[PDB]
Amino acid sequence: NPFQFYLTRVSGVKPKYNSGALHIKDILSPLFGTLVSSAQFNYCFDVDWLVKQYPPEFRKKPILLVHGDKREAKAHLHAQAKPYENISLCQAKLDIAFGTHHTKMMLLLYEEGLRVVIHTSNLIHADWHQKTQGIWLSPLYPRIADGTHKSGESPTHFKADLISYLMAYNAPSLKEWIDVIHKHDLSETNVYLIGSTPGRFQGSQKDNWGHFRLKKLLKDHASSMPNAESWPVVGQFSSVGSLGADESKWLCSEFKESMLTLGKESSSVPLYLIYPSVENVRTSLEGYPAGGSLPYSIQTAEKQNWLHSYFHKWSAETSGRSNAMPHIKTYMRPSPDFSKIAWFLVTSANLSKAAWGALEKNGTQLMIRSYELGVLFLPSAFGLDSFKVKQKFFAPMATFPVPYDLPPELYGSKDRPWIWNIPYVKAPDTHGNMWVP
């Protein structure tokens, strides 16, 4: 297949639903390359667990942990890594209030070349055990011969765009990784990078990040079709930020507007949001503890009950993962009958202004609080007008593997969105327990 989009292995489904999946031990295996060093960008780390996922022969190679922790959290992470002399840390600057470093990425430097992995899992046991998570695997990028002058650039501009993302950190340990990338040929890359970095962007920088970056790519590299207003937008996420008192404040004004862009020309488009219900979480493989990774607070939720009429249940029979709660985040544009899609995005970005950006200063400035990263699949980058949706995720190799069921199913009248900081004591979970925060 040309897409190299994978799900993580799930303990407890039948072998047929893990055949095409990847565990972290598979990604770091010597079959993927002879490791010289690596960088792990993430949010949450269990360093003891992480080192055990590298092959024994590679466990002393240098590792850089890129994180956003401060003060006592930062002290804790340093204490976790100190036992391992080969581990260095890079604290991503977070100069805007309430920002987070959410990007999940591996840079893997080999004897044989370089690989980039952009994914959705934290580096802790539970994120790779029974959740639905997404992975994009780059090709093996060869080194450019010393003395040769070539760009090593792809038609999607991936090499320059990844360097730009890393340069935004202004960090010495990542300048070294920038120099590594400069030395490699990334021309085979067929995805576009979509990142978020913290800051306030105007003018020439407005289109660099967040939902304006998505808008720009859709304007430049996708085509509008007749009856485009009938092609829905689907967003699928594991948490929700404060979006405002009604849909006109951000969700349907600037976010949806970016997401419905197609082509260069100048809304009734249906918007489906997929987010686990309480019943989804209760009957999941993990039980209520899955809700520890779906951090929608009651304080936020009670100010935006209007939003929940957009919510659709998690259902993933296509990949055997209806009971594996989602920590993947995806956004896509299906056709009215859900048989095709105009594009697909897998990312760390949840449904929040912090991640995607919010316009300020009379519409002239895009303010982002967080680091996020994802990759965008556009048919034009594969010589196509659209992607056909693969009917079974693990079953004409140009069909795109959507990991959950279409069409999405609306919440029933008795369903409620999972809200993590209130109790659920009406019915027990798959392990026999209630939820008492």
Asked if 418 is part of the footprint of ligand GJP (rule: CB under 6 A), the reply reads: no
Q: How far apart are CA 166 and CA 13, in angstroms?
A: 37
Give min distance, CB of 328 to ligand GJP, in A: 11
- Of the pair 198, 232, the CB lying nearest ligand GJP is at 198
Give min distance, CB of 373 to ligand GJP, in A: 11
Give min distance, CB of 387 to ligand GJP, in A: 27
Q: Out of 101, 184, 312, 327, which one is annotated catalytic? A: 327
- Is the bond preceding 407 in cis, omega lying within 30 degrees of 0? yes
Asked if 295 is part of the footprint of ligand GJP (rule: CB under 6 A), the reply reads: yes
- Of the pair 38, 293, the CB lying nearest ligand GJP is at 293
- Of the pair 43, 387, the CB lying nearest ligand GJP is at 43
Q: Is 353 annotated to bind ligand?
A: no
Q: Is 329 annotated to bind ligand?
A: yes
Residue 99 · residue 68 · CB < 8 Å: yes
- Of the pair 43, 136, the CB lying nearest ligand GJP is at 43
Of residues 32, 41, 43, 418, which one binds ligand GJP by CB under 6 A? Answer: 43
- Of the pair 100, 386, the CB lying nearest ligand GJP is at 100
Asked if 55 is part of the footprint of ligand GJP (rule: CB under 6 A), the reply reads: no
Q: Is residue 327 among the annotated active site residues?
A: yes
Q: Out of 101, 102, 119, 312, which one is annotated catalytic? A: 102
Binding to ligand GJP (CB under 6 A): which residues in 116-155?
A: 122
Site string for ligand GJP, 334-353 (x = CB under 6 A): --------------x-----
Count of residues interacting with ligand GJP (CB under 6 A)? 6
Tell me how long the chain is.
437
Give min distance, CB of 98 to ligand GJP, in A: 12
Give min distance, CB of 206 to ligand GJP, in A: 25
Query: Helices 172-182 and 158-167 sit at what angle, rounded to 10 degrees?
Result: 170
Give min distance, CB of 239 to ligand GJP, in A: 7
Of residues 53, 196, 293, 323, which one binds ligand GJP by CB under 6 A? Answer: 293
* Bridge partner residues of 236 (DSSP): 274, 330
State the Cα angle at 395 between 392 and 396, rounded to 5°: 100
Shortest Cβ contact with ligand GJP: which residue? 295
Site string for ligand GJP, 82-121 (x = CB under 6 A): --------------------x-------------------
- Of the pair 261, 348, the CB lying nearest ligand GJP is at 348
Binding region: 104, 329
Q: Write out the binding residues for substrate.
A: 104, 329
Judged by the rule CB under 6 A, the positions of this chain that interact with ligand GJP are 43, 102, 122, 293, 295, 348
- Residue numbers annotated as active site: 102, 327
